[PDB]
Write a protein that binds this ligand. Structure first.
Ligand SMILES: Nc1nc2c(ncn2[C@H]2C[C@H](O)[C@@H](COP(=O)(O)OP(=O)(O)C(Cl)(Cl)P(=O)(O)O)O2)c(=O)[nH]1
Ligand SMILES: [Cl-]
Ligand SMILES: [Cl-]
Ligand SMILES: [Mg+2]
Length: 326
DNA sequence: GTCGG
DNA sequence: GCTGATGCGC
DNA sequence: CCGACCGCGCATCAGC
């Protein structure tokens, strides 16, 4: 919050490029600049001071001087006044509605929450659930509640098969005092990169959590990735908790470390780290880290026995989860 | 929009 | 039906 | 300059 004004402005600009302009690289440039600045231990005094940081260039420098001078940015001022842009940005806030669908909805005269509700027929499954819990998904999750959720998930999974290992990742594993949702990494000895000895490994867990009424809805579901909704049980007479977004990712047991690295994030941390790996001649995904051949083709997976091993391969000093929040 | 070669 | 591209999300 | 910008699972569609 030291440079909150500036980072907020950059994020708004990032969201505009992504949602309205559909310019992903500009979106990421703004996000990176915001990220690099939010980590800066000094209260920025000029765009010049900011341009010193990698990720901030001439354009963002100028915008920072304007913001520092007036306390706002005219470019954004005009974007907020723009109806089409305003409507498109709003609609993308519904899970399942992206830049394309939002712009398409606006063309059809569907621009508001009221319009969406009276046009459910025009939404796919994911979008319907997104609209259903629109308000709830905007809410933050206190770490206290994350702990209760963790307890339920780990205990329910244990009941299905004592061999399952569920790990809560995302901002929770990074030590955040609140999270936007729950991310669960799941492993089972029967599912490795070498073979899938038992089917429905993910399904069984999903089924068990729906059975005890923890999982309430599904946005999408496959062999290794579940994307849905959950809710903590409330006591008698007490208002019920808000519904929460939950993702469960089944990863090969022998590829746990690359999996937990990926799922722990942050997303920008992953991007920076993956980009650095490339520069160092390696490629990283949630399954492995492989070297890049002379022509640029990925090679065979390298042995990994801890998250640190991955960091060493790319010549990075180990960074604890709590320090990966970029 | 920013960056490295 | 399958394969490939695209949207969307993590 | 100028092109590279992380990598991938699921849902949906187009074309066959
Ligand atoms: N490589 C890669 N990994 C990603 C990406 N997006 C997400 N991940 C990985 C890294 C992410 O940590 C993880 C979970 O996705 P979230 O739940 O979206 O991210 P959280 O960090 O949990 C959070 Cl702070 Cl947005 P919140 O607490 O509010 O949920 O997935 C991406 O674009 N790329
Ligand atoms: Cl772009
Ligand atoms: Cl792989
Ligand atoms: Mg999360």
């Amino acid at each position: 919050t030291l440079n909150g004004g500036i980072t907020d402005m950059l994020t708004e600009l990032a969201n505009f490029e992504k949602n309205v302009s559909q310019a992903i690289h500009k979106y990421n440039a703004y996000r990176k600049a915001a990220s690099v600045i939010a980590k800066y231990p000094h209260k920025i005094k000029s765009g010049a001071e900011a341009k010193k940081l990698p990720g901030v260039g001439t354009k963002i420098a100028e915008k920072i001087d304007e913001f520092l001078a007036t306390g706002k940015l005219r470019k954004l001022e005009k974007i907020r006044q723009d109806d089409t842009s305003s409507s498109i940005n709003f609609l993308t806030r519904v899970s399942g509605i992206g830049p394309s669908a939002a712009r398409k909805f606006v063309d059809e005269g569907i621009k508001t929450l009221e319009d969406l509700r009276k046009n459910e027929d025009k939404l796919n499954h994911h979008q319907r659930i997104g609209l259903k819990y629109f308000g709830d998904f905007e809410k933050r999750i206190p770490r206290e509640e994350m702990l209760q959720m963790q307890d339920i998930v780990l205990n329910e999974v244990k009941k299905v098969d004592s061999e399952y290992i569920a790990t809560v990742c995302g901002s929770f594993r990074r030590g955040a005092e609140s999270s936007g949702d729950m991310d669960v990494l799941l492993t089972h000895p029967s599912f490795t990169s070498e073979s899938t000895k038992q089917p429905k490994l993910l399904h069984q867990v999903v089924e068990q959590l729906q059975k005890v009424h923890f999982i309430t809805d599904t946005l999408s579901k496959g062999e290794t990735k579940f994307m849905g909704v959950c809710q903590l049980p409330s006591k008698n007479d007490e208002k019920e908790y808000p519904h929460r977004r939950i993702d469960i990712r089944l990863i090969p047991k022998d590829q746990y470390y690359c999996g937990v690295l990926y799922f722990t994030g942050s997303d920008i941390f992953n991007k920076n780290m993956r980009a650095h790996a490339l520069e160092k001649g390696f490629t990283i995904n949630e399954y492995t880290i492989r070297p890049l051949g002379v022509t640029g083709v990925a090679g065979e997976p390298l042995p990994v026995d801890s998250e640190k091993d991955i960091f060493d391969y790319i010549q990075w000093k180990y960074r604890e989860p709590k320090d990966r929040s970029e």
